[PDB]
Amino acid sequence: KQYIPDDMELIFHMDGNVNGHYFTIVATGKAKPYEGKQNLKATVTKGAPLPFSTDILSTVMNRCIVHYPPGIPDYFKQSFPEGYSWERTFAFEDGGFCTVSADIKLKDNCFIHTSMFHGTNFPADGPVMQRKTIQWEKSIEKMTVSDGIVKGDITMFLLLEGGGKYRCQFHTSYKAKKVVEMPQSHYVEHSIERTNDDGTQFELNEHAVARLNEI
């Protein structure tokens, strides 16, 4: 009956382009969905070494990795076994705009993640094209039901080389392939850390938990 276990495996294939630089990445990883914790190692197979900040991709490489308390409906764990997809728009403060889509399927113990990524209008000596991002700041995303599906808005900042912050607005729409119990408006706190990039291979780690307002 439980299609998602305490320990999951992760596979990822990403194809995309940024400013007309095409690339392709594969990665494998391990996760504990009920703890909201996961990690990855990615390997760039085309376009490497990446000429842009890995950070614009990192949040693209699954809301099932979020500790959901009882009394918040878990949209993501309930979408299985059929799975769910999501689309996301990234509007960066310097005009850079990224559209991304993703399919997530379930095969026994392994999440299979299908990511397409298009970024455009990133300035030549911006922090993205010159790869001067350090990390995303920890975040809290707001999840609301809209057109019968879950939506997820978050204002996000990248810390830059030498300090200072580079703002981005996320709009993610989550589409379950199936009729699930709909959640209320709630939040999901996030924290991603990017270890060990070298252009070609990188490590990701993320902790996320869903919570409510303190009414």
Author numbering: 5 to 65, 69 to 222
Verbatim from the authors:
Wild-type SAASoti and its monomeric variant mSAASoti can undergo phototransformations, including reversible photoswitching of the green form to a nonfluorescent state and irreversible green-to-red photoconversion. Photoswitchable, photoconvertible and multi-transformable proteins are fine tools for multimodal measurements using super-resolution microscopy. Reversible photoswitching often proceeds via the cis–trans isomerization of the chromophore, associated with the change in its protonation state and plane distortions of the π-conjugated system.
The crystal structure of the C21N mSAASoti variant in its green on-state was obtained at 3.0 Å resolution. The analysis of crystal contacts demonstrated that SAASoti is a monomer supporting biochemical data. The mSAASoti has a typical β-barrel fold with the chromophore 66HYG68 resided on the central α-helix. In spite of the moderate resolution, the electron density clearly revealed a maturated chromophore in its cis-conformation as well as conformation of nearby residues. The chromophore is fixed with a number of hydrogen bonds with neighboring amino acid residues. Histidine group of the chromophore forms hydrogen bond to side chain of Q42. Finally, the OH-group of the tyrosine moiety is hydrogen bounded to side chain of S146. Noteworthy, the orientation of the chromophore’s tyrosine ring is stabilized through stacking interaction with side chain of H197.
